[PDB]
Design an enzyme around this catalytic site. Structure first.
Site: not given
Ligand code: MG
Ligand code: MG
Ligand code: MG
Ligand code: MG
Lengths: 245, 245
Positions: B10, B8
């Site tokens: 962010d 991922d």
């Molecule tokens: Mg994230």
């Protein structure tokens, strides 16, 4: 003897929505040896720059670049501008407009829809009732449906009636969309700033100078010497006749 | 011994919506000497590229770039992708969705509104009920109003109920907006293509692996070895422990 030649873009210096002929471009720079030269278009700056040079060359090639009818202004290479419609209209009227548009479009049941129905620009709201096409095929499909069902036309009639007397104007975004802008924010907008730049004469050239056309008001304005042209070749000839006889 | 580490973005490799720490970046390239590395984010490709390098460097720095939850895919420097939501959902359901959103938003009377309420992306529709903020000041103002009036939250409740059983999912676009996407088009989407790339192991790292979080499904999927992290420093430590003990 401080003179400006100010040109509409689409149909006046270039084929609509397309790149400028290099031979026209070359003449404009020759004209520039006698006068200052400027463009004014309804499109945003990115679109206009794309038609008139590579990257941001347009602001170097022209003494004035007026995008969104002059609400965005480049002057001698620098961004002088700009004004926002929300500042001019106020939030209440703006939201009345938007919610009327949202409500109207919600009741439109078409073969299909896309997105960005209401886009905020500086000089206007661009309204696209079917949504913005994702491909050329969809764009053509939407254009044909709009012609048959008069989608934009009927939407504008309802809008003009609803907002009668409240100072909104409506014009074509070509195919697919229409612009909503404050009264006075047609091409004439750019004249207010130009008024302060000490020109002895401002010659305006456009290809929609007939009533109804998006050049009419600026053509007709007493601040300009007006010229009607039919093509970029017509424009160049007129300049040769006036400045290089 | 053909291994992929999939991250991922962010909160996992970078501060939310912000640029990657150069020291983390540098570690990822070191990790790359042992394994292939990839990112998967809900954001569009432009946003992800912006956070992970300059220009399009991200596709060079990473073996896989999955934008919009994997509906957009770069693989070893080249755009492999992509799928469109309209293709998957069909025009009828899509327009039902859109017209429900249009109609709902038309009845919202707020302090103020802007534009681009419904944006078409590849993997989703991004819905912004107040409109997209024009400045940071407006963005903060909209965030606060949304918190007080639960604008996005209540809109999603109405949407989920209306489209119960029809295969739509809803998730936060952070502040200001929420995404609507087809069931299965969460981060797991990218696993289907990865399934064909002959990895012996795929390690997934994310910071929202708890139920409700936008990493949950891909974390929980039996095709990945799942890892929960709380920060980009946590991520780097976990990789050191697993691959460079
Ligand atoms: Mg994230
Ligand atoms: Mg024209
Ligand atoms: Mg005149
Ligand atoms: Mg797993």
């Amino acid at each position: 003897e401080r003179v400006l030649c100010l040109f509409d873009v689409d149909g006046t210096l270039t084929p609509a929505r397309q790149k400028i002929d290099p031979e026209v471009a070359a003449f404009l720079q020759k004209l520039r040896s006698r006068v200052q030269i400027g463009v004014v278009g309804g499109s945003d700056y990115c679109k206009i720059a794309e038609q008139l040079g590579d990257g941001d060359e347009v602001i170097e090639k022209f003494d004035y670049v007026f995008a969104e009818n002059g609400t965005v202004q480049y002057k001698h290479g620098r961004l002088l501008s700009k004004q926002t419609i929300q500042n001019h209209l106020g939030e209440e009227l703006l939201q009345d407009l938007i919610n009327f548009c949202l409500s109207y479009m919600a009741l439109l049941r078409l073969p299909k829809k896309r997105g960005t129905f209401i886009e905020f620009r500086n000089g206007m709201l661009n309204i696209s009732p079917i949504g913005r096409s994702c491909t050329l095929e969809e764009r053509i499909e939407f254009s044909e449906l709009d012609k048959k069902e008069k989608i934009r036309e009927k939407f504008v009639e309802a809008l003009k009636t609803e907002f009668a007397g409240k100072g909104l104007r409506f014009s074509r975004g070509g195919q697919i969309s229409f612009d909503v802008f404050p009264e006075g924010w047609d091409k004439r907008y750019c004249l207010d700033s130009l008024d302060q730049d000490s020109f002895d004469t401002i010659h305006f050239f456009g290809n929609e100078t007939s009533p109804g056309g998006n050049d009419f008001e600026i053509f007709a304005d007493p601040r300009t010497v007006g010229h009607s042209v039919v093509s970029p070749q017509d424009t160049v000839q007129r300049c040769r006749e006036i400045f290089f006889p």
